[PDB]
Structure formats: structure tokens, C-alpha cells
Design a protein around this ligand. Structure first.
Ligand SMILES: Cc1cccc(C)c1OCC(=O)N[C@@H](Cc1ccccc1)[C@@H](O)C[C@H](Cc1ccccc1)NC(=O)[C@H](C(C)C)N1CCCNC1=O
Ligand SMILES: C[C@H](CCC(=O)NCCC[N+](C)(C)CCCS(=O)(=O)[O-])[C@H]1CC[C@H]2[C@@H]3[C@H](O)C[C@@H]4C[C@H](O)CC[C@]4(C)[C@H]3C[C@H](O)[C@]12C
Ligand SMILES: C[C@H](CCC(=O)NCCC[N+](C)(C)CCCS(=O)(=O)[O-])[C@H]1CC[C@H]2[C@@H]3[C@H](O)C[C@@H]4C[C@H](O)CC[C@]4(C)[C@H]3C[C@H](O)[C@]12C
Length: 329
């Protein structure tokens, strides 16, 4: 009764992948696991783009349980876009497996140069029902309505460079994951794992500002103007043309993000957002922070933030629970 989960592997510290399998043959696929996208895709063997020639492709021939919606699709991210068509089939996960409506992909063209650069094969969305293209029911919620899960939640324990592995468990909470009390944050929404936190860094603040908690984002994002107020006299330096900064790893001026709610207070310290890049130069870190202006002032608590806090996404309680992870194995 050790619960079900999936092994998810640190990729150099930037981001992580859980491998999973569509088709009764459990056809291989390495994925991104994104809270924020509500749809899962994989690249068909009918794929016509150079992108695809890199990792594993779906042949629906080889599936016994294959059904075809056949309706043409185009999945859009901010990072770019994959397009294909809709299909059905069962998809196993850890010890658990069911029949799902998913987007067979045949076109990476507009997801380069990042996809053909990556190792992951498709993006398992983990988002919300009303946000699915083609009306799709989220996985975790199906495992409940199908009584296959003990609660309709999913729990994210993220890995660390050469330190320990990571585990997305789906139903119940594994205690060995966190120390200090889980704090639940209400969704200020009904399509997105986003809450209302009061983000400060030094003199600078924002208060009552949507914070998205996205598994498929490998940075913090910050309102551009807030990020500028942030960097005033801090001895960091934008890369030319790229919206990324670099700095000495030792830079003592690098702040500590602090987030307040009525309920709980959370904090990010440089070591979690600094990204060593010796590859360039000595004790030279890249910041893992991007400036990004929505219409309403918003942050995105991604890999750095999560790799800090054990984090639980409960559909039924329309909340994200947060507490501090453990050190190692
Ligand atoms: C879900 C959705 C709804 C409406 C509109 C759009 C554009 C929507 O999709 C946007 C979206 O999900 N983007 C992010 C978060 C989001 C939601 C809304 C607006 C903006 C962002 C995130 O969740 C997933 C998305 C896709 C992705 C692509 C390649 C590898 C991994 C992930 N990842 C990224 O874009 C991220 C950064 C740049 C945000 N990213 C880029 C690569 C490398 N790693 C990384 O961290
Ligand atoms: C999402 C934001 C853009 C926000 C914005 O607001 N930018 C204007 C959009 C253009 N228009 C004005 C025409 C929109 C339509 C008009 S409208 O007025 O309707 O909005 C853009 C700006 C810079 C972009 C990143 C960098 O590239 C580097 C990198 C390249 C990879 O490959 C993919 C990942 C990554 C991290 C990129 C992600 C994302 O992509 C970023 C954050
Ligand atoms: C973008 C459109 C609205 C149309 C629009 O954008 N109308 C004008 C605004 C001005 N712009 C921002 C275009 C100026 C760009 C100037 S530029 O300098 O780029 O040229 C709106 C409509 C619904 C919105 C999403 C949902 O809520 C769910 C979710 C909430 C999170 O919290 C943030 C992510 C997400 C996916 C939202 C993103 C975005 O918010 C959407 C697509």
C-alpha cells in the first residue's frame, strides 16, 4: 500500500520529465508534466516534421484499444505551437491506466528550436476541465469518477542534481515528502492552478497578485516593471537579445522572494533561482527569472519554487497545498 507515483528525472537542474506510455503495448514516451495545460499530446508516426525524427512516435496500428476522433487540432503555448489531429486510446501511469482523448501530433515546425533541442516527447497537461481544447476531462478527475483513485488530487515532489529523484503521486499524499505544515491556498479561479499571494522583494511589493503554480515552466516569471525595480543596482547583466540575466553565483545583493497570504507565508532564496553555467565562465550563474506582463499582475511559481516546496494540487478542494520538501534519500 506504498501508493502509485512516477519517477521524474532532473534534466541538468533546468527541468524534469516523467516517462509515460499510450497504447496497450505501453508504447514508450518521455514527457513534460504541465499543470496549466489541460491536454496531453504525443507525436504520431504520421509525423512529417524533422522535429519528430528525434524521439519515439505513436503508431495507432499497434494499439488494440485505439479509436479515432480524427478532428484536426492546433495546440498553442507561449513558447510556440504543435498541430495535428485528435485520437483515443488507453494511457498507463505508474500502476494506473485508462482510456483518454489525446492529440496525436504530426507537426513540430512551430515548437522549434526548443523541441528538437529537448529530450521530452510530448506534454502531459495536468490542468483544468473548462480549459481543455475539445472538452477533455482531466486524468486525475477521471481516476475519481472511475473510483480508481482515493482522492482526485496529484502531488508533486521535485528532484535535485545528484541529490535525490522526484515523484508525481496521484491519489493520497506521501508523508516522507515534506516537513512543516501543509498550507492550502484557495483557487481565485476555475480553469488554472492560480491563487492570490502578496509578493514582496525588499522595498518593492505588489500584494494580492495572481500566482500561477505551473509544473511545465522551468523559471519564476515576474511582472517586467517589478523585475526592473528588482534589479536596480544589483551587479547582474542582461544577455544581449535574451530576456535572461547572469551574475556571479556569490552576488550578495540577490534578493529573497517572499509571498504572503491571509493563510500562509512562503519565500524563495537565490540558491533556488541561480543556475550555474561554468560552461561560460567561473562562478558565473544565470538567473532563472523572466519578466512577463499578463493583463493582471501575475507571477508563475515554476521549477525553482516547486523544487523548494512540496506542493499538492487538489481539484475537489479547489486549492494548492504547499509545504517544505525533504533533503535527500
Ligand atoms: C495552457 C495555455 C492556455 C492558454 C494560452 C496558452 C498560450 C497556454 O499555454 C501556455 C503555457 O502553458 N505555457 C507555460 C505557462 C504559461 C501560461 C500562460 C502564459 C504564459 C505561460 C507552461 O505551462 C508550458 C509551456 C510550454 C512548454 C514548451 C516547451 C517545453 C516545456 C513547456 N512552457 C513555457 O512556455 C515555459 C515558459 C517560457 C513560460 N518554458 C519555455 C520552454 C522551456 N521551459 C519553460 O519554462
Ligand atoms: C510570452 C512572451 C511574450 C509576451 C508579449 O506580450 N509579447 C508580445 C507578443 C507579440 N504580439 C504583440 C504581436 C502579440 C499579439 C498582439 S496582441 O496585442 O493581441 O497581444 C515571450 C517573450 C520572450 C519569450 C521567451 C524568449 O523568446 C526565449 C525563449 C525562446 C524559446 O524558443 C521559447 C521559450 C522562451 C523562454 C520564450 C518564452 C515566451 O515566448 C517569452 C517569455
Ligand atoms: C489574452 C486573452 C485576452 C485578450 C487580450 O489579450 N486582450 C487585450 C489585452 C492586452 N494585451 C495583453 C493583449 C496587450 C499586449 C501588448 S504587446 O506589448 O504585447 O503588444 C486572455 C483570455 C483568457 C486568458 C487566459 C485565462 O484567463 C486563463 C489563464 C489565467 C492565468 O492568470 C493566465 C493564463 C491564462 C491561460 C489566461 C491567458 C490570457 O490572459 C487569456 C488567453
Amino acid at each position: 500500500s506504498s501508493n502509485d507515483n512516477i519517477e521524474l528525472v532532473d534534466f541538468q537542474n533546468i527541468m524534469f520529465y516523467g516517462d509515460a506510455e499510450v497504447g496497450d503495448n505501453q508504447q514508450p514516451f518521455t514527457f513534460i508534466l504541465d499543470t496549466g495545460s489541460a491536454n496531453l499530446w504525443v507525436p504520431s508516426v504520421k509525423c512529417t516534421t524533422a522535429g519528430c525524427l528525434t524521439k519515439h512516435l505513436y503508431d495507432s496500428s499497434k494499439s488494440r484499444t485505439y479509436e479515432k476522433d480524427g478532428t484536426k487540432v492546433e495546440m498553442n503555448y507561449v513558447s510556440g505551437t504543435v498541430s495535428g489531429f485528435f485520437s483515443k486510446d488507453l494511457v498507463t501511469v505508474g500502476n494506473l491506466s485508462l482510456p483518454y482523448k489525446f492529440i496525436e501530433v504530426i507537426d513540430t515546425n512551430g515548437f522549434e528550436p526548443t523541441y528538437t533541442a529537448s529530450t521530452f516527447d510530448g506534454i502531459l497537461g495536468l490542468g483544468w476541465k473548462d480549459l481543455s481544447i475539445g472538452s477533455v476531462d482531466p486524468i486525475v478527475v477521471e481516476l475519481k469518477n472511475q473510483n480508481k483513485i482515493e482522492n482526485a488530487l496529484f502531488t508533486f515532489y521535485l528532484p535535485v542534481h545528484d541529490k535525490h529523484t522526484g515523484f508525481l503521486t496521484i491519489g493520497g499524499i506521501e508523508e516522507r515528502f515534506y516537513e512543516g505544515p501543509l498550507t492550502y491556498e484557495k483557487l481565485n479561479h476555475d480553469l488554472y492552478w492560480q491563487i492570490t499571494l502578496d509578493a514582496h522583494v525588499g522595498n518593492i511589493m505588489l500584494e494580492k497578485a495572481n500566482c500561477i503554480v505551473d509544473s511545465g515552466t522551468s523559471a519564476i516569471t515576474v511582472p517586467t516593471d517589478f523585475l526592473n525595480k528588482m534589479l536596480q543596482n544589483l551587479d547582474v547583466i542582461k544577455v544581449p537579445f535574451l530576456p535572461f540575466y547572469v551574475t556571479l553565483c556569490n552576488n550578495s545583493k540577490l534578493p529573497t522572494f517572499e509571498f504572503t497570504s491571509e493563510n500562509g507565508k512562503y519565500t524563495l532564496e537565490p540558491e533556488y533561482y541561480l543556475q550555474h553555467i561554468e560552461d561560460v565562465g567561473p562562478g558565473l550563474c544565470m538567473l532563472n527569472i523572466i519578466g512577463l506582463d499578463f493583463p493582471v499582475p501575475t507571477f508563475i511559481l515554476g521549477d525553482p519554487f516547486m523544487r523548494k516546496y512540496f506542493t499538492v494540487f487538489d481539484y475537489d478542494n479547489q486549492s494548492v497545498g504547499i509545504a517544505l520538501a525533504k533533503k535527500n534519500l
